[PDB]
Design a binder for these strands. Structure first.
Ligand SMILES: [K+]
Ligand SMILES: [K+]
Ligand SMILES: [K+]
Ligand SMILES: [K+]
Ligand SMILES: [K+]
Ligand SMILES: [K+]
Ligand SMILES: [K+]
Ligand SMILES: [Mg+2]
Ligand SMILES: [Mg+2]
Ligand SMILES: [Mg+2]
Ligand SMILES: [Mg+2]
Ligand SMILES: [Mg+2]
Ligand SMILES: [Mg+2]
Ligand SMILES: [Mg+2]
Ligand SMILES: [Mg+2]
Ligand SMILES: [Mg+2]
Ligand SMILES: [Mg+2]
Ligand SMILES: [Mg+2]
Ligand SMILES: [Mg+2]
Ligand SMILES: [Mg+2]
Ligand SMILES: [Mg+2]
Ligand SMILES: [Mg+2]
Ligand SMILES: [Mg+2]
Ligand SMILES: [Mg+2]
Ligand SMILES: [Mg+2]
Ligand SMILES: [Mg+2]
Ligand SMILES: [Mg+2]
Ligand SMILES: [Mg+2]
Ligand SMILES: [Mg+2]
Ligand SMILES: [Mg+2]
Ligand SMILES: [Mg+2]
Ligand SMILES: [Mg+2]
Ligand SMILES: [Mg+2]
Ligand SMILES: [Mg+2]
Ligand SMILES: [Mg+2]
Ligand SMILES: [Mg+2]
Lengths: 61, 49, 65
RNA sequence: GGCACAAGGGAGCUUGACUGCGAGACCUACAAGUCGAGCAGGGACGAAAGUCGGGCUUAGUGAUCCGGUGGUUCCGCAUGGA
RNA sequence: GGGAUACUACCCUGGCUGUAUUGACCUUCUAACCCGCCGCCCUUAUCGGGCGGGGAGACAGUGUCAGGUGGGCAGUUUGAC
RNA sequence: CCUAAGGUAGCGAAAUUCCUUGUCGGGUAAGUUCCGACCCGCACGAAAGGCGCAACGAUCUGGGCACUGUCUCAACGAGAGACUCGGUGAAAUUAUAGUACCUGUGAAGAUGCAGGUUACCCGCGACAGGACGGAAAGACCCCGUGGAGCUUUACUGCAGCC
RNA sequence: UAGGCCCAGGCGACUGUUUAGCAAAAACACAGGUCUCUGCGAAGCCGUAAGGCGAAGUAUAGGGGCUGACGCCUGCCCGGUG
RNA sequence: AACAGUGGUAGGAGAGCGUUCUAAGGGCUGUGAAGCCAGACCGGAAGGACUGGUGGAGCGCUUAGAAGUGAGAAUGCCGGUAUGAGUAGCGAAAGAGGGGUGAGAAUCCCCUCCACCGAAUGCCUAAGGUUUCCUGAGGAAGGCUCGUCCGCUCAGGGUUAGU
RNA sequence: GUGGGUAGGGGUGAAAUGCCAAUCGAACCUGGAGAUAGCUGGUUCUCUCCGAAAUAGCUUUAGGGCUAGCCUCAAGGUAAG
RNA sequence: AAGCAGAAGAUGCGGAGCCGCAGCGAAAGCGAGUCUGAAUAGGGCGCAUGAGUACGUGGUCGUAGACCCGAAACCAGGUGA
RNA sequence: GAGCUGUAAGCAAGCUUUGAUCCGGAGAUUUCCGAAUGGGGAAACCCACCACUCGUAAUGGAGUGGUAUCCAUAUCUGAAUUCAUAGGAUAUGAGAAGGCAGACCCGGGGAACUGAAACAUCUAAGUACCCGGAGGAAGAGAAAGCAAAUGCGAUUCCCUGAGUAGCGGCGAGCGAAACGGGAUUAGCCCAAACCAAGAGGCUUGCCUCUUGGGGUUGUAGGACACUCUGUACGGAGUUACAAAGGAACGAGGUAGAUGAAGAGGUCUGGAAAGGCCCGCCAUAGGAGGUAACAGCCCUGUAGUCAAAACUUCGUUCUCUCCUGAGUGGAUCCUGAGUACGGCGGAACACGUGAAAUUCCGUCGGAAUCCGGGAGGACCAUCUCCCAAGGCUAAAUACUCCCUAGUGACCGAUAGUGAACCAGUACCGUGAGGGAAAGGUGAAAAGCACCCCGGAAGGGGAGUGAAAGAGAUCCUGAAACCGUGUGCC
């Protein structure tokens, strides 16, 4: 799924709000990005959120 | 409800505010003190007991 | 469940010593050009809730001391 | 509906087209609406009595909520402010 | 003449160059990302993955935010005597 | 004068013409229909196509011939029901009913009320005038601050798209 | 057991299709005409996405709108809306 | 006691009857309880007794308490039974007679003739049914009549693959 | 004919809003759910005391509602009607 | 009251809390007064003219389906070619 | 401890004091389907491979065991590609899968009808529903807390605060918390500084990673220095604070045992448990049954006992584990893409509002002890705490089920849909919907025999208290259907 393998950031639900305050359901996506990282010490390319990449601890291969 | 005629409360304006720091005192009139005996020091602790 | 006070009324009325309700006058918000000073002096004072209305709404203020 | 001791016409000075009110009444389901002597403050006119809280009377207006503005010996979420 | 001329001290107007920043824009590049292109391997496999070329490339795609459009769809409104 | 421009060809009382059975001609003894013309096109018209058109049509429309019980105007015969007997045996409906006619009265249209008239008791085969007959809480109309489907330059939104 | 026929007109060219159970028709479809989108990961469509139809096709192809065989034709207006 | 009053819808107020259960007292009942069925009794009403018949083991009374407490109507729900009514209908069609069986025969069996289908109303074989198939026995129900008969009831039995 | 596929804010439609299990302008079943109904129908024993209204005002109000008027019970004033 | 002892009881304990005896004001606050007001004025609301509280029965009301029956519909999850 | 071979009659054949049937504990067996798992499949069926075994000359046939996928562990190989890695093979696994209790709990998604007398903000409601994770409970929890006192001292739940403060087309409505009274109580462990060891990058005297020690807090604590002290004398513990194991004993659960006192007399009666007259027992006058109502007839009850085996709890012992005080203020440590902020939402009773506090997506982005957070915008002062790591029992919620019981609960149209062969019959393609139906008698003593009849059904005779109790068999109302006739 569109869930960050490292931080777990995934889609979350909430409301959209019009000016008249009408509420309708919507989701917030994680900013997931295809990157090569170590998965069990074996470099696989998986989806990681930009935020998890921001640090730099998540090293690309 | 008044059938659609504007209800009384809605016709009238709201008034005032509530003070958070409002103090209420337990009042005692002089007639109440008369119940005690002479020379007694009437404190709130004595009154409450 | 407890009977719930009518909150709109609680903001508008006040119980007097003998249990009457004190209220403000209407027509005291604006358009004061269109009202004589006599009206304004009188509308400025408080009034009591009428007997007819009091019975209709007495229960709305039951929880209020 | 009233008005010719004018409420109609003219002239002098002025701002009562006042502030706090208000016994008691009319009208009225309520909300409102109407009249009011008299009291106090400080004034206009008048020599004084006295009259003046708009207009000869009765239409010319819109609740609450929510905002704007001015004033304020009110409140201010520990305290001083805000 | 309003003001005096040398020279020096400190400054302004205008323009120019350079140093260092600051964006905006222009091209170009390759390593991100993309390939519903080719070759090899996993592998008897028109999927997927790995490797090597090629193309494209800082765009696109996607996330967050914003504006416009939007009866495609949806909830409703559309007076009394 | 106005407009962006003012309808051309063709067709026209038409699946379109209200007035209207338009007027004229034909068809009939008699033709609001039909056919041929005319054109004052209420309110035709050129790809929501215009005007023609052989073939086709359980299409719509008018007229002839053949043919006939469609009709004048009904008659007879056959079979199946009906009818009688033996066997078997429902249903809708139903406030209780010993349930006439006339005029009137009445929530204004009576088997049931009033005043008259008429009527011995019980069935069978038939007809449908009434029981405002049965069936289906009227679909018409109006109302409800009822519903649903649809529309849009109604309001407020959402997807999609830029 | 086995077509009634003829004349004339309207509509649709035609065979075909349609409201199972009140409408078979002039309605739909149709071959033909035209407009428009689409350079291929095509446009369009289904799905949140992956994955698909389009298409194992490639502008003489594919999608969408309108018209509806054939014959003769299809005039004027780009101000408004797209 | 006197005087006066006493129609009534919506509605307000009062006093009661009755049903089920509980408590406490006091009883009834196999010498017959409750229920049911009669009757010509009693009370102002809701209602309550008494007697007899049926019934065959539970039930009143007094005071108080608690409620699933009172039905004639809701095109009410369920059950039972009526009316229509001995009425409609008995579901396309050729049967007749002679024997047999039997408690009983238009209807079952056999015989004869006749009649109908015969591009089917014949033969085979699907899907589907699932024992309906065969033999013997039966006539409660089912069979739109009847029934000795049946695709029904009761007993048995019956389906054989290297192709 | 057989075996399959498309499912309801959907499918399928040579298009009739047609068809999707005798149901279709939005299938059927269960649940929210005893939806809501200012509307219609129904609301069960008896007697006694008293006994209306069908009006005014306001109302997205008019066959609904609210206040007043008119009824009833209780307590006061009392004799004011 | 919860709670702790106790027969699923009565009861005992439990004084936190609740209502009333003081009201007036929007409030600071003052207090048989208080608010308005410049005011020992007038007026409003109060006091003098005082009874509340706990429990039970009954009437009515609020929130619950709320006296009973009745929609056409809406939504959610499924079942059907 | 004397009969038994179920309902369930019947016939048949048998078993049992050498102890059956029956009751309880623990084992064995347990076809096929089902997560179903060797493969397939239209569940309950079909077809295989590998070992071993039966059988045949052999094929064909049969029995037992193994053979799913994922995950974990070990081993062997290792592509494109050189080392490698991916991948593949083998072995080892009481690892996972699925179900449900229609409940309770924590989360992911999340309506509409309805209310507002319309309706969109709002309400209904974070409800119904779908999905995931679980546990016997779950969640929360040991202060960056509540407060404003000569303060309190984790969390949870009950009472109260209070329908208050507040929120709100300030409409309909929504609605706290703290203090106070109670139930229950319980606290702990890491990260970092530092020490020791070891290893790889040598980044080259530095660094990272890995082990053990150390250490856990706020008017600061710890490291680090100083002393004092223990090293088990003593303390704790498997419910947190480390983690398993074993005994002895006690009290229970899962069958049972024992257990007082009248056939008292007499009266009806089919039958006494009833009536009348007398007794007696009682730590037993609960209850059911017995031919009408039983403390003394039966099973029982009160009371006192009982377990080969399995199981629950408790207490001791064994066992296991374990140092904690004071003084320093040189330096060092005290949780970073974190806190927090903008933008978009959500949760807080609190609808963006003056909006503190908490959570999510996106982007930006601190201080770090001279530090940091909160006290409802925000600043200053003061007060109280020390976030960005984890664990933690009890009080609480719920009941499908087990045991024992209770009811001013129902008594066959009631009470569960279901008292009865009921989720059945029937209806539907399916999801699904969904009934009706209790009573002979005390005992079958269930009508021998005779008569009419083919039988059914009757009439006698018998049984019985009663057959007008004869199988839809207690009672037997009304509608409705008949027969006879007193009056018309
Ligand atoms: K719409
Ligand atoms: K007959
Ligand atoms: K008559
Ligand atoms: K009639
Ligand atoms: K008797
Ligand atoms: K399906
Ligand atoms: K009964
Ligand atoms: Mg709505
Ligand atoms: Mg109207
Ligand atoms: Mg043109
Ligand atoms: Mg046209
Ligand atoms: Mg055109
Ligand atoms: Mg045309
Ligand atoms: Mg007849
Ligand atoms: Mg008349
Ligand atoms: Mg008449
Ligand atoms: Mg009607
Ligand atoms: Mg045609
Ligand atoms: Mg045709
Ligand atoms: Mg039709
Ligand atoms: Mg037809
Ligand atoms: Mg066309
Ligand atoms: Mg009742
Ligand atoms: Mg008849
Ligand atoms: Mg026949
Ligand atoms: Mg046969
Ligand atoms: Mg028969
Ligand atoms: Mg259908
Ligand atoms: Mg609801
Ligand atoms: Mg209005
Ligand atoms: Mg509403
Ligand atoms: Mg014994
Ligand atoms: Mg004994
Ligand atoms: Mg007996
Ligand atoms: Mg029942
Ligand atoms: Mg009996």
């Amino acid at each position: 799924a569109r869930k960050c393998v490292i931080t777990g950031k995934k889609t979350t639900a909430g409301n959209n709000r019009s000016h008249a305050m009408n509420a309708s359901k919507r989701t917030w996506g994680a900013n997931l990005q295809k990157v090569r990282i170590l998965v069990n010490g074996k470099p696989k390319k998986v989806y990681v959120s930009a935020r998890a990449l921001k640090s730099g601890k998540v090293e690309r291969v | 409800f008044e059938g659609g005629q504007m209800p009384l409360f809605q016709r009238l304006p709201k008034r005032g505010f509530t003070n958070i720091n409002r103090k209420e005192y337990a009042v005692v009139n002089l007639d109440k003190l008369n119940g005690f005996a002479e020379g007694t020091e009437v404190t709130p602790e004595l009154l409450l007991e | 469940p407890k009977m719930k006070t009518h909150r709109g009324s609680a903001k508008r009325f006040k119980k007097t010593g003998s249990g009457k309700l004190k209220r403000s006058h209407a027509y005291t918000s604006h358009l004061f050009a269109n009202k004589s000073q006599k009206q304004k002096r009188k509308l400025r004072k408080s009034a009591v809730v009428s007997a007819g209305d009091f019975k209709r709404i007495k229960q709305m203020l039951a929880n209020i001391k």
